[PDB]
């Protein structure tokens, strides 16, 4: 699809069989989701945002479907104001910015 | 232009005569620039993201050129780690996400 930016670009994603709303975020290197349980082991990761750095859990090779497009990659889990889809998965679904 | 998300979408903008580097950020409601002086009056505001909130000065009706396209709107100034062009100005240059 083509998504304009008059409103937040929030889309539906599916992870672990659950539907969730998430923000397509070109300013994010990575994908950060609100607290949830994911399979496997996790490793520590520090991320920096507008308000400073926080510690999150890193889960690799996680299946997630975004607006109908499948992606498998790294998902970070931690205290985030909203579920964020970052460039690591935006590139997997072929997303680009255009003007 | 069509901008890839393999790398951070950093572009050159011009504001107050000054040329600067800024991140096209569909995850940001507003545009936030690193500390600088702007003309006109401003009012304080708090904005949040990963890491929490930061206090910024809000200036209205500021003109910026983004990759040659003029855009007018509110510009917040504060301790952001990088200049961010948010949706309030991305809409003005006809910026969309496509996949």
């Amino acid at each position: 699809p083509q998504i304009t930016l008059w409103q937040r670009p929030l889309v539906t994603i599916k992870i672990g069989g659950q539907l969730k709303e998430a923000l397509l975020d070109t300013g994010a290197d990575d994908t950060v989701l609100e607290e949830m349980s994911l399979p496997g082991r996790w490793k520590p990761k520090m991320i920096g945002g507008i308000g400073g750095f926080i510690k999150v859990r890193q889960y690799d090779q996680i299946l997630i479907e975004i607006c109908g497009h499948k992606a498998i990659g790294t998902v970070l889990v931690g205290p985030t104001p909203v579920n964020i889809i970052g460039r690591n998965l935006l590139t997997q679904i072929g997303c680009t910015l255009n003007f | 232009p069509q901008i890839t998300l393999w790398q951070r979408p950093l572009v050159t903008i011009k504001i107050g005569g000054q040329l600067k580097e800024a991140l096209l950020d569909t995850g940001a409601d507003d545009t936030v620039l690193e500390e600088m002086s702007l003309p006109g009056r401003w009012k304080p505001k708090m904005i949040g993201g990963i890491g929490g909130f930061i206090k910024v000065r809000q200036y209205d009706q500021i003109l910026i050129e983004i990759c040659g396209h003029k855009a007018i709107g509110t510009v917040l100034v504060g301790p952001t780690p990088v200049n961010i062009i948010g949706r309030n100005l991305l809409t003005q240059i006809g910026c969309t996400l496509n996949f």
Binding site: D25, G27, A28, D29, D30, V32, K45, M46, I47, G48, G49, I50, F53, L76, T80, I84, G86 | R8, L23, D25, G27, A28, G49, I50, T80, P81, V82, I84
Partner: peptide
């Protein structure tokens, strides 16, 4: 660092 903006 991993930047999430």
């Amino acid at each position: 660092y991993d930047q999430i903006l």
